[PDB]
């Protein structure tokens, strides 16, 4: 009686919401405690029972602030080291970002309480997943979006991993929210109905992990090299850094020519405008072709548009065998989804002169097309996403092609130091290779450089913060997974009919 009465105090539920929210962060890399996601969601769903609507929104806000406050605070690293702002505003922006993200999880908990106030089996297993889908969709969409920390990504090695190739990661977000809601109902009402339903709903997708939607092509097996140039962020875009960077990347590549069919350099590895590097690129391209090797590398490219102005792109270019270099070549990719404040500054005229954080080197990029053809090298088809774009599962899936041999992502994660950010980023990358049943080549500056197999497994990786090259054999795969054929409109029809059924019963 006294114990139950203590838990139903509102100031206590808030404190418990921080702890239960923060606990979610342990589900993602580098911690990888996948049950922490179920614990964290049970907290969010149980802690909101039997509360007023605006009371429940306060609890849902604090849960997110525990989650995002402990999970994405690594943004502080990049803001502190390169932001050039005083201490208090630096942490104010980090708490500001974590508070903004928490609106979407507070909005979720408010709506769920007004429309479904009774702690029923319908509000936890039907209304909650659908409304979560909507609010999480809204979080990853408004103001360019930021869909970081979705619990489905923690199931990359867990029992739900067979579900991603069929409906994508957001279906795992859906099921985890649902199974966690039945467990939460099973405790508060001390009923075994929801427990047995939750354990079967959770266990049913386990045999899925054994379906191989893909077929490996061992005849196409190559040696690939990815050079981790380890250029320090503070010097990377300094003009005096360029010759050293070119020497590092070139010296690592020349001895592998004739041995590695494909060589990859990371995001904007060549830190100069493509048009200023034509003697280098031409000489390099001829050298690659004589030996039978192809190179894909990041670079910056300012290109003249229709209205006689320059659009500067964050771009990948290709060179060498089966991909002869030209400034007029179409074998290239321009980053489409730009990172806010790092690659473009909203309200540019107001914010640019405030602090170096709002005027970072090369923070004036344009956006390439949403859909772009694969890169082509040696006869290999590479679906490309640059850095952050690899976490956008639908966008990656929409650029995917049936004749894609590998997924390719190149990234520069040095902004985030030795924090957990690079590992969270790396983990989400792995979900794309599982969803689409292709290997993924990840070339980074110092971030996690690795080759990911067609089921999300780590085939190879080199350690962070070192100047080395990962050279390994990799094998393409062919074949279409259900999620490749569809994207996530099926999950959206489930979200719609659950959300419809749920809103119906609540209109009584
Ligand atoms: C009953 C108990 C309830 C208590 C509720 C608590 C819930 C949990 C609370 C917090 C969880 C999250 C805490 C992490 C927050 C910050 C972590 C931290 O400080 O370590 C950060 C560094 O942490 C690290 O990255 C350590 C190294 C980890 C990488 C090496 C191991 C990798 C493991 C592989 C992971 C999976 C990859 C794929 C393999 C399957 C600090 O970084 P910094 O550059 O020095 O500056 C950071 C300034 N912000
Ligand atoms: C409404 C409330 C919002 C709060 C406003 C302030 C808080 C924003 C805090 C952080 C925003 C971004 C922090 C700096 C990140 C810089 C990374 C970057 O852009 O670099 C590039 C990074 O590109 C990548 O995709 C690699 C990894 C990026 C992962 C993204 C993680 C940070 C995203 C946080 C932004 C949050 C969105 C805002 C909410 C809608 C590459 O480096 P470079 O080519 O050598 O040169 C960079 C070009 N100048
Ligand atoms: C208000 C109570 C809500 C309870 C639950 C019912 C909510 C409605 C449920 C389902 C809406 C039906 C939408 C399915 C249509 C599918 C179309 C389609 O394939 O496009 C999909 C995306 O298009 C959409 O689904 C649009 C988003 C639908 C939002 C509908 C919710 C209304 C928004 C305001 C509601 C605010 C809370 C309610 C306030 C009382 C697939 O593309 P993607 O990969 O998700 O894009 C990612 C880019 N960031
Ligand atoms: C205090 C901070 C604000 C609190 C609440 C925030 C509400 C802000 C108003 C909601 C509308 C914001 O305006 C937002 O701008 C960007 C424009 O890039 C749009 O998003 C835009 O880029 C995305 C990329 O994912 C495209 O998919 C989208 O089609 C496009 O319109 C958002 O769809 C739009 O909603
Ligand atoms: C409640 C019962 C509902 C049963 C669903 C039966 C379909 C009717 C509802 C959808 C209407 C048309 O159905 C449509 O089919 C195509 C073929 O996969 C889907 O997919 C199509 O559009 C998407 C973009 O959204 C493309 O990325 C995709 O390449 C294309 O094939 C559409 O997203 C879906 O909207
Ligand atoms: Cl009190
Ligand atoms: Cl019930
Ligand atoms: Cl050729």
Q: How far apart are CA 325 and CA 295, in angstroms?
A: 10
As to burial, measured by CB atoms within 10 angstroms (0-12 exposed, 13-18 middle, 19+ buried), residue 82 is middle
CB-based contact 265:251 (threshold 8 Å): no
Mutate to test the pocket of ligand 4, among 141, 148, 339, 367 (most ligand atoms within 8 A of CB): 141
Q: Is 319 helix (H, G, I), strand (E, B) or coil?
A: strand
Residue with tokens 């034509």: 278
Q: What are phi and psi of 313, to 5 degrees?
A: -110, 150
Cβ–ligand 1 distance for 23 under 6 Å, the answer: yes
| Distance in Å, CA 182 to ligand 7 centroid | 9
Pairing of strands 215-216, 222-228: unpaired
Q: How far apart are CA 251 and CA 234, in angstroms?
A: 22
CA angle 41, 44, 46 (to 5 degrees): 100
Cβ–ligand 2 distance for 96 under 6 Å, the answer: yes
Give the H/E segment covering residue 234. Answer: helix 233-236
Q: How far apart are CA 407 and CA 404, in angstroms?
A: 7
Q: How far apart are CA 135 and CA 106, in angstroms?
A: 9
- For 8-19, give one letter per residue: b (16+ CB within 10 A) or e: eeeeebbebbbe
Ligand 5 atom nearest to 487, measured from its CA: 27
| Distance in Å, CA 134 to ligand 3 centroid | 5
Q: How far apart are CA 252 and CA 168, in angstroms?
A: 37
Extended strands (E) in 251-366: 262-273, 294-304, 310-320, 332-334
List CB contacts of 450: < 8 A, sequence separation 6 or more: 426, 442, 458, 459, 460, 461, 462, 470
Cβ–ligand 3 distance for 180 under 6 Å, the answer: no
Q: In what order do the strands lie in the sheet with 294-304?
A: 332-334, 310-320, 294-304, 262-273, 222-228, 468-474
Give the H/E segment covering residue 406. Answer: strand 406-411
- For 287-318, give one letter per residue: b (16+ CB within 10 A) or e: bbbeeebbbbbbbbbbeeeeeeeebebbbbbb
CB-based contact 410:266 (threshold 8 Å): yes
- The first and second tokens of residue 311, run together, are 């659009």
Q: Which residues pair with 303 in a beta bridge?
A: 311
- The first and second tokens of residue 158, run together, are 């867990």
Q: Is 282 helix (H, G, I), strand (E, B) or coil?
A: helix
What residue spans of 207-241 are helical by DSSP H?
Answer: 233-236
Q: How far apart are CA 346 and CA 376, in angstroms?
A: 34
Q: Which residues pair with 478 in a beta bridge?
A: 215
* Straight-line distance from the first to the last Cα atom of the chain, in angstroms, rounded to the nearest whole number: 33
As to burial, measured by CB atoms within 10 angstroms (0-12 exposed, 13-18 middle, 19+ buried), residue 117 is middle
Q: How far apart are CA 60 and CA 37, in angstroms?
A: 15
Residue with tokens 């196409």: 220
Residue with tokens 């009919």: 497
Cβ–ligand 5 distance for 493 under 6 Å, the answer: yes
Cβ–ligand 1 distance for 76 under 6 Å, the answer: yes
Q: How far apart are CA 156 and CA 449, in angstroms?
A: 18
CB-based contact 51:11 (threshold 8 Å): no
- The first and second tokens of residue 326, run together, are 């030209």
CA 447 to chain centre: 14
What resolution in Å is listed for this PDB structure?
2.4
CB-based contact 172:428 (threshold 8 Å): no
- The first and second tokens of residue 342, run together, are 């790092």
CB-based contact 115:503 (threshold 8 Å): yes
Q: How far apart are CA 468 and CA 471, in angstroms?
A: 10
Q: How far apart are CA 41 and CA 63, in angstroms?
A: 9
Q: Is 198 helix (H, G, I), strand (E, B) or coil?
A: helix
Cβ–ligand 5 distance for 500 under 6 Å, the answer: no
Long-range contact list for 348-351, CB < 8 A, 24+ apart?
none
Q: How far apart are CA 177 and CA 125, in angstroms?
A: 8
CA atoms within 13 A on the CB side of 432: 31
Gyration radius from the chain CA atoms: 24
Q: How far apart are CA 107 and CA 387, in angstroms?
A: 29
**CB atoms closer than 10 angstroms to residue 397:** 20
């Amino acid at each position: 009686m006294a114990f139950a009465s203590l838990i139903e105090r509102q100031r206590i539920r808030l404190l418990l919401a921080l702890l239960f929210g923060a606990c979610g962060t342990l589900a993602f890399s580098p911690y990888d405690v996948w049950p922490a996601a179920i614990i964290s969601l049970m907290g969010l769903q149980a802690l909101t029972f039997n509360r007023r609507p605006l009371q429940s929104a306060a609890i849902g806000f604090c849960w997110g602030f525990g989650l995002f406050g402990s999970g994405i605070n690594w943004v502080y690293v990049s803001i502190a080291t390169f932001g050039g702002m005083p201490g208090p505003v630096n942490i104010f922006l980090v708490v500001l970002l974590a508070a903004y993200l928490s609106l979407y999880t507070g909005l979720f908990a408010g709506v769920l309480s007004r429309l479904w106030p009774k702690t029923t089996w319908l509000r936890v297993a039907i209304a909650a997943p659908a409304l979560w889908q909507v609010t999480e969709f809204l979080r990853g969409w408004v103001l360019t979006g930021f869909p970081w920390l979705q619990f489905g990504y923690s199931q990359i090695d867990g029992p739900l991993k067979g579900l991603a190739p069929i409906m994508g990661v957001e279906a795992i977000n859906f099921l985890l929210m649902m199974v966690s809601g039945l467990l939460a109902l099973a405790l508060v009402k001390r009923n075994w109905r929801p427990l047995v339903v939750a354990v079967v709903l959770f266990a049913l997708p386990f045999p899925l992990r054994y379906i191989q939607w893909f077929t490996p092509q061992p005849e196409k097996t190559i040696q690939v090299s990815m050079v981790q140039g380890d250029i320090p962020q503070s010097l990377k875009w300094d003009e005096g850094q360029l010759l050293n960077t070119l020497k590092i990347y070139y010296n690592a590549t020349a001895p592998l020519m004739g041995k590695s069919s494909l060589i990859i350099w990371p995001e904007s590895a060549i830190t100069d405008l493509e048009i200023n590097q034509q003697p280098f690129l031409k000489a390099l391209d001829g050298e690659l072709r004589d030996k039978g090797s192809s190179l894909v590398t990041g670079i910056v490219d300012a290109r003249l548009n229709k209205q006689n102005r320059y659009d500067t792109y964050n771009t990948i270019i290709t060179l060498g065998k089966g991909a002869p270099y030209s400034y007029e070549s179409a074998d290239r990719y321009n980053k489409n989804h730009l990172v806010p404040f790092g690659e473009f500054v909203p309200l540019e005229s107001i914010l640019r002169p405030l602090a170096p954080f709002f005027d970072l080197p090369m923070s004036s990029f344009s956006r390439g097309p949403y859909i772009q053809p694969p890169l082509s090298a040696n006869g290999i088809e590479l679906t490309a996403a640059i850095a952050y774009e690899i976490i956008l599962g639908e966008q990656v899936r929409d650029n995917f092609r049936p004749d894609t041999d590998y997924l390719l992502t190149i990234s520069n994660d040095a902004w985030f130091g030795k924090s957990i950010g690079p590992w969270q980023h790396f983990q989400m990358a792995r979900m794309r290779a599982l969803e689409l049943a292709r290997p993924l080549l990840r070339s980074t500056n110092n971030g996690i450089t690795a080759v990911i197999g067609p089921q999300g497994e780590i085939q190879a990786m080199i350690p962070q913060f070192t100047r080395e090259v990962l050279t390994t054999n990799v094998t393409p795969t062919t074949g279409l997974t259900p999620y490749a054929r569809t994207g996530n409109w099926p999950l959206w029809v489930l979200t719609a009919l659950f959300g419809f059924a749920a809103v119906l019963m609540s209109l009584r």
